[PDB]
């Protein structure tokens, strides 16, 4: 499941959309609208664990974010959400330019960034795999030491 949230400057969720059909039931039970970003994502992860999407094997969540040191506050919230839930995380900063390219092909900002990155490093990742492979699977395929890493 892929979910897109819109937040205001105080990190209140003002809009929420399922980026695929199997995100709809999780959004309905989570009801993230008007909630704090931390609360919204924490319940989304809680529901995901209940429904079976998050488990000991696939224990990685992929976040991506774009503005319009503010993003650092957002990034800290995303780290807290994952650590407090006991799941590993990858956070991929994005841009409005890339978000629109992702929307145009019905991909999340995170999967789009990862799909583009794999192509540039010569990894065999077709469009269907980029959209449907599990988070832990696509990260194992793309993160092979062929591009720069930093913290």
């Amino acid at each position: 499941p892929s979910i897109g949230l819109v937040i205001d400057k105080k990190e209140k969720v003002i809009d929420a959309k399922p980026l695929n059909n199997d995100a709809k039931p999780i959004l309905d039970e989570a009801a993230p609208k008007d909630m704090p970003l931390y609360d919204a994502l924490s319940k989304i992860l809680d529901i995901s664990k209940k429904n079976g999407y998050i488990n000991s094997a696939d224990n990685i969540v992929l976040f991506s974010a774009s503005i319009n040191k503010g993003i650092q506050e957002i990034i800290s919230t995303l780290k807290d959400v994952a650590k407090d839930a006991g799941v590993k995380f990858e956070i991929i900063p994005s841009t409005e330019e890339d978000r629109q390219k992702a929307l145009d092909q019905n991909l999340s900002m995170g999967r789009y960034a990862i799909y583009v990155k794999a192509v540039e490093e010569g990894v065999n990742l077709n469009l269907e795999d980029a959209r449907n492979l599990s988070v832990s699977e696509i990260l194992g395929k793309v993160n092979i030491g062929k591009f720069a890493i930093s913290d």
Binding site: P1, S2, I3, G4, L5, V6, I7, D8, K9, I14, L19, L37, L41, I44, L45, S48, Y53, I54, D58, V61, L62, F63, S64, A65, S66, I67, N68, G70, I71, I74, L78, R99, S108, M109, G110, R111, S134, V135
Partner: peptide
Amino acid sequence: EYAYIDVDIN
């Protein structure tokens, strides 16, 4: 408005 956040699970 201020920021967009996507989350991918499974």
